[PDB]
Write a protein that binds this ligand. Sequence first.
Ligand SMILES: O=C(O)[C@H](O)[C@@H](O)[C@@H](O)C(=O)NO
Ligand SMILES: O=C(O)[C@H](O)[C@@H](O)[C@@H](O)C(=O)NO
Ligand SMILES: [Mg+2]
Ligand SMILES: [Mg+2]
Lengths: 395, 395
Amino acid sequence: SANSDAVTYAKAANTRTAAETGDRIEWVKLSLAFLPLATPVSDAKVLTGRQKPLTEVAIIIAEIRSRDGFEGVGFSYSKRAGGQGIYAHAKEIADNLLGEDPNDIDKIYTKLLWAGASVGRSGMAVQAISPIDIALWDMKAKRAGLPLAKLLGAHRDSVQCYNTSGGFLHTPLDQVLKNVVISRENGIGGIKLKVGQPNCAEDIRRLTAVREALGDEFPLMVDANQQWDRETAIRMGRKMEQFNLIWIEEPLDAYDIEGHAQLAAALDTPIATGEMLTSFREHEQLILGNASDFVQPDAPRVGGISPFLKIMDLAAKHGRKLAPHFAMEVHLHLSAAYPLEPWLEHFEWLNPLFNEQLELRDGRMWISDRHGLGFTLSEQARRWTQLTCEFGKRP
Amino acid sequence: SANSDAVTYAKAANTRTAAETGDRIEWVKLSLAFLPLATPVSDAKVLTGRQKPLTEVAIIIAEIRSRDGFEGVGFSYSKRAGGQGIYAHAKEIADNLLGEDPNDIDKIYTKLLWAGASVGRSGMAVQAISPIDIALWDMKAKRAGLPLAKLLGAHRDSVQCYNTSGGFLHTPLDQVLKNVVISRENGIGGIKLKVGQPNCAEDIRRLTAVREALGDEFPLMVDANQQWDRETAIRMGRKMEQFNLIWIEEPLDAYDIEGHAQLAAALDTPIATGEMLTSFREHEQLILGNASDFVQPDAPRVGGISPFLKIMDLAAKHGRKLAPHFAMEVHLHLSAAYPLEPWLEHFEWLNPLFNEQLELRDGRMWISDRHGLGFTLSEQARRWTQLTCEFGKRP
Ligand SMILES: O=C(O)[C@H](O)[C@@H](O)[C@@H](O)C(=O)NO
Ligand SMILES: O=C(O)[C@H](O)[C@@H](O)[C@@H](O)C(=O)NO
Ligand SMILES: [Mg+2]
Ligand SMILES: [Mg+2]
């Protein structure tokens, strides 16, 4: 009988609990490696004097192994100063992972934030948690025998991909046009050109040439890397309407919410921003402020996959498109899980860190059948490792 | 080298894709069963004449089997009219599942909504998707070899649990006091008393008696099931402050947002509501309107686990507590995944449907080590099945 005049209670023949049987983390290895860039890279931030050319990329890696035989790998990074701090903090909190059930990712995240409460819930501290958070997701996906995108649930099996590495400002227009061809012949689905240099006319010149070379249809976008003031932004915006760009990225300071909102409302061309934000909170302020048509989160930068998922849902709720920044090795899976058609950003910079390469074809990057992130650390990654530490004992 | 003066592209040694290797749904079985209630149940909705006593519960079950050998089970229900419609719609859209990768839960959900676009994105139609959505989550958890709570990521391994079945209005005060003892001796962590009958004084009498019997500390809550108007709600609210209730539930019409908000702001006692809502959208309107301190979603009612997860995140963002309604067999896992300390509602009604029983001890319900939802359909569930249909072919 379902019920009676009183109340009755069913008893559990098997009281074996999830707590007593769950897996446990027993080993963790952190690494700080540096990805050398033979060709110094300069976007508008360098041409305006805000920064020096980029010559390397810091990569902070986390490897986690569980008692029951599972392993996860993940990473965060830093372009310019930040890598030493991310690694150092990760090192100071990593031992908190030992003995935890690796499936309780959020519970662990919270424990790590408390262990470092003094240093906040945004910025560097969460970027130190990113490698760990990502490794745990990588592990859970593997535990299920699924590529990460499938563990999250995918809406597509491949995502539109555009290249950024071939459109930097240290590159002469001549070489940029050559890059467009190389990229296009390799199946790229779009081209992003860096703009925002002091000489506005020169950017217009380079942009018109690229559109000319690509033809009217090919997806083309520009990126100012925060280098314009409001006056210049709207001026350049008006003048670029003719190129039918997929979007204008970071026209203003990453924190100029009303400035972005204003440009977005004034132009038909989509506005994109967010790569520099370092937390859900920060992205939330921009989204509530209607700053852009395209939201561009960066899992490593915002604290990992866990917060990135929350940002995705917020963006979707506000009807925005998603175009994650950098780290395609991770973002491929996240954007594959986004409800609206997204874009993936391509750089070849991290290719040497892994043994496996992603398939770029017919303008899209395809999700392989490999589990989790679908990557294994290369020997080169070990060679480029400068600092490393371990906790626990390999199972 | 990470980069060069031009741009280069890595090639994929293994282009095997996630699309070509993914699992596939090959069989689906739907059932409409009826859970008989020997003792007709009456809450305030019956005493005010809005409805007739509850004598049974409709249970709509979905069973899904994949090519690679995985299976998932899930269900939704209806108290009073609704079961026939939920089953009928589920039956009319179920064949859309055949050939789909069961891991793309959201992609599938969207396909099902489109197949039934004419009937909306809330209400009965999504309640027909609930059994399916839940079965797919059950399957994914099993695929990972984890209880559902662990697949989602848990914050606790057990959750505070209170009983509701022993505090209904068709039950004489004498028997209610006996029920309190039975429940307390069986390890219940709290008691909920139904109120909201025309005779306000009688409810106060019953409530004072229960508090008296329980002692000052024991968690006690009340539920009006929408039966008070605003005037009476605040009046009863003021008078119940003395009982230090964990919450006052559904004091007003489920859609009286400002009414609830007003009561919540006027009383220190928490206000709880939401069980009757049938979608994320509906819950969103109440949360944005600050209707209650406790958000009470119902996975079956809102369209399944997928939408329920979105509701959880919204609630958390607004700093609200979670107290899911009914279906503890499913809600145990969801509330275990909630960041703030939640409450689980107990009814023994569904116990006969499954072979396994949940462990209630020391005021909390413990998550077993069983995978997915951790339940298998009983022979009794088959005996109570009135209609059934199948699609595809058992693997
Ligand atoms: O040179 C840099 O600072 C980076 O490569 C930067 O331009 C890049 O992260 C970016 O903004 N791409 O969208
Ligand atoms: O009798 C009913 O309508 C139900 O049992 C209802 O009271 C129950 O779903 C509820 O509101 N419990 O919290
Ligand atoms: Mg950029
Ligand atoms: Mg209720």
